[PDB]
Amino acid sequence: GPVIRVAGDSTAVGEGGRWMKEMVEAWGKKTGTRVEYIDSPADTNDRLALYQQYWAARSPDVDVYMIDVIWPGIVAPHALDLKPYLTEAELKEFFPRIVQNNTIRGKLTSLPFFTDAGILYYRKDLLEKYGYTSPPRTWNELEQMAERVMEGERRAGNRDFWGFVFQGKPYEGLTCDALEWIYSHGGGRIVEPDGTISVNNGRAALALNRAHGWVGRIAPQGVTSYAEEEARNVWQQGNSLFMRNWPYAYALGQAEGSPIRGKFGVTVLPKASADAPNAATLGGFQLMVSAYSRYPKEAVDLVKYLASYEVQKDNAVRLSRLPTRPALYTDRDVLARNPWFRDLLPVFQNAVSRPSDVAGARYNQVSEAIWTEVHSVLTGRKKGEQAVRDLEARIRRILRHH
């Protein structure tokens, strides 16, 4: 009978690809359907290019794709409309914000799978060691704590120790980190939901300058090459006081044999001052049936299974990834394993989105502009003032007649 083929997640990022393949095989065994898993590169923007090869070809060789929250507006022509396959009651079990994000010109492109928000990981043993009782609330405090703990850990002999790691590589992850920096300085959303390109302002410029000031000082010089896993591996070996990353890193850090197990917490990222808004960039993935799938019925069944309560629960318990069903955030087993899901739920709900709705099918070009201009500041090629002006001009060209 049919072979249902799935491309989504990567075995290069934590346990996501291995776990996704396991869930697909479980569905296959449950329903007596043959399945195949096709691996993907680590970085979301590389995945988009890979999947676009299949879509350009109208290829029937993948039935189900795991698609980034930033993609519906780009990928909608390649998605089977799921709306007729779900009842209104079924759809209401997901956060309405994500269902709305996934709906493009009335087409439900994809089912919400897991959400995501940028958070601050911090070594609580080290905060205590150095006389701090709370994680930092402001970027200035983060800097002061990092300098002090670094001075001490280096003096004690850990020459590998850094104050802060984050995603500074030129790719989509840096758009995520940079939106957090800019927004948390009161510098706006880069492109506002109304279309206004707002990034050329002194608060956004300050945010980028500040981040440059970390590189080679509290963060490794090589941070300008780090994606999620490069940052996580410095952190997880016990060599960083702080890390900006997504929820998945938590379960990995708690695993048996992790050097940092039991030694860290998570909190909202810092901000410039008490009246700036908190910033956590909205992430996460959705489940799309290919418009080119020869087996829509079976592929829809698989996507419903993957998005189900018990598969999302398993994702939360084992991989510390955030459900897209509000009912899971009150589940006793989810909460006992991840108590921070409760503490940060409002951070997750107030996550700031990248400008994917407003940029639509042009979002990838906009983000490339953002990450290359931000990167030119991290590398020291440009100051923030010049980079936000140059970025404004680039985005104006991209979106001109959008």
Ligand SMILES: OC[C@H]1O[C@H](O[C@H]2O[C@H](CO)[C@@H](O)[C@H](O)[C@H]2O)[C@H](O)[C@@H](O)[C@@H]1O
């Ligand atoms: O659970 C974390 C996931 O990390 C990646 O996805 C996040 O980071 C991307 C940027 O690098 C965002 O565009 C995305 O929205 C985030 O969810 C990774 O691509 C995933 O497969 C991981 O599960």
